[PDB]
Write a protein that binds this ligand. Structure first.
Ligand SMILES: *C(=O)c1cnc2ccccc2n1
Ligand SMILES: *C(=O)c1cnc2ccccc2n1
Lengths: 10, 8
DNA sequence: ACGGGCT
DNA sequence: AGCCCCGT
């Protein structure tokens, strides 16, 4: 995910 | 059809 | 019939 | 390490 914790999604 | 990781 | 990107 | 998920 994120960045951070790319996306989702992208 | 969606593109979120592949985009077909 | 389809796998992707940075904090 | 990850509110990781999606339709035409
Ligand atoms: C696009 O709308 C779409 C929907 N379902 C799929 C299933 C498998 C491969 C690609 C697909 N694309
Ligand atoms: C993109 O490569 C990708 C892969 N797996 C998925 C699962 C559920 C929703 C979206 C997805 N996208």
């Amino acid at each position: 995910t994120x960045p951070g914790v790319t996306x989702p999604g992208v | 059809x969606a593109x979120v990781x592949a985009x077909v």
